[PDB]
Design a protein around this ligand. Structure first.
Ligand SMILES: O=C(CSc1cn(CCNC(=O)c2cccc(C(F)(F)F)c2)c2ccccc12)Nc1ccc2c(c1)OCCO2
Ligand SMILES: CCCCCCCCO[C@@H]1O[C@H](CO)[C@@H](O)[C@H](O)[C@H]1O
Ligand SMILES: CCCCCCCCO[C@@H]1O[C@H](CO)[C@@H](O)[C@H](O)[C@H]1O
Length: 336
């Protein structure tokens, strides 16, 4: 049962892995990531060494949460695990945790290189994002920081959503920029809109220099809050500030996306509405005619509810450590 391990030093860091995994090579910035080859399956893989996983309660808690999350995410368009291992033989020697996933090689910038894509390519890429989003949203998880650097893409444009990555605010919902503390899943839809817009045009939709400039760019496009949106703002100061603004009309999107598929323009109008309750959901979007060539109602799976309460307890360091260890022990590789 216990595979044989071997040690070796990469970028000043000691890595201890099973023998199945050969030709380890660092690819960058928890911890550190090497591409490797998995001789057990024939697959190229990325391997992550968690950095200092059980050094403080907060490190411990974050480790547990990353492990839990990834073990529950099983979907073509969401990052998942092929393996999870520790050199340790027992809870007492347990101080390292390594996560294995399929090599993707590149994120969405790497694949796009600020260039305009064809409408077909655009449909395919956004479709996968929405298909992945539908899945995460069904588990009652909101991503909150969807951006191209949080999207793994390989040579054939097969795309996955990421928990954390390896400009950072250009994709954020305006309600997130303003630190509201109730949020819809549609904060994520907002981010899809900005991504899509960029892919159709070649240009960043809202390239602010800073927090306020970004909010000014957003207001130019989608106009100032109208009457329905105002009565939903509880903060009295926020409220008065907004009214103090000279009202501006929504731009028409046909003027902004000159010659794009009018179906592309339509969907984007449904993604980028200022009021979040009024934005298309990921499930409604997947049914939008723009994705006619890719939409399959029978292959857009949904997740079981993910208990977020287990991860936001206040446990001692050894409790988290032991719970993470069980999670390592109980792991089962996907069918392959
Ligand atoms: O291809 C992959 C796997 S998908 C990916 C994830 N991330 C977030 C960083 N996390 C990991 O890489 C990671 C590794 C193991 C386990 C896990 C866990 F989340 F826990 F499952 C995550 C990426 C960032 C950029 C591009 C792809 C990815 N990685 C990879 C491949 C080639 C690269 C590269 C990274 O860096 C650029 C040089 O070439
Ligand atoms: C909903 C509450 C919003 C508070 C934001 C108000 C603070 C914005 O103050 C802003 O700073 C910039 C110059 O420094 C300018 O671009 C703006 O015109 C100016 O009003
Ligand atoms: C410049 C003013 C920006 C307006 C941002 C509000 C648009 C988001 O929409 C609102 O946001 C909240 C989600 O956090 C919800 O509580 C509200 O129900 C929803 O209307």
């Amino acid at each position: 049962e216990r595979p044989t391990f071997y040690r070796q030093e990469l970028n000043k860091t000691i890595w201890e892995v099973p023998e199945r995994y050969q030709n380890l090579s660092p690819v960058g910035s928890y911890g550190s990531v090497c591409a490797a080859f998995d001789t057990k399956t024939g697959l190229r893989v990325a391997v992550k060494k968690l950095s200092r996983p059980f050094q403080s309660i907060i490190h411990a808690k974050r480790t547990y949460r990353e492990l839990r999350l990834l073990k529950h995410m099983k979907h073509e368009n969401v990052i998942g695990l092929l393996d999870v291992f520790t050199p340790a033989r027992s809870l007492e020697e347990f101080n390292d945790v390594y996560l294995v996933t399929h090599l993707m090689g590149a994120d969405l910038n790497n694949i796009v290189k600020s260039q305009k894509l064809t409408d077909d390519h655009v449909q395919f890429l956004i479709y996968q994002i929405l298909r992945g989003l539908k899945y995460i949203h069904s588990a009652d998880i909101i991503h909150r920081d969807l951006k191209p650097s949080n999207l793994a893409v390989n040579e054939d444009s097969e795309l996955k959503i990421l928990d954390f990555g390896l400009a950072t605010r250009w994709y954020r919902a305006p309600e997130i920029m303003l630190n509201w503390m109730h949020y819809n899943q549609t904060v994520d839809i907002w981010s899809v809109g900005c991504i899509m817009a960029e892919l159709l045009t070649g240009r960043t939709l809202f390239p602010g220099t800073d927090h306020i400039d970004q909010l000014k760019l957003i207001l130019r496009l989608v106009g100032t809050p109208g009457a329905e949106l105002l009565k939903k703002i509880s903060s009295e100061s926020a409220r008065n500030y907004i009214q103090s603004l000279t009202q501006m009309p929504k731009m028409n999107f046909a003027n902004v996306f000159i010659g794009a598929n009018p179906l592309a323009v339509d969907l984007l109008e449904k993604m980028l509405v200022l009021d979040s309750d009024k934005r298309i959901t990921a499930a409604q979007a997947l049914a939008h005619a723009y994705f006619a060539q890719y939409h399959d109602p029978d292959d857009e799976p949904v997740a079981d509810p993910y208990d977020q309460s287990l991860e936001s307890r206040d446990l001692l360091i050894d409790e988290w450590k032991s719970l993470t260890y069980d999670e390592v022990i109980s792991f089962v590789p996907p069918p392959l």
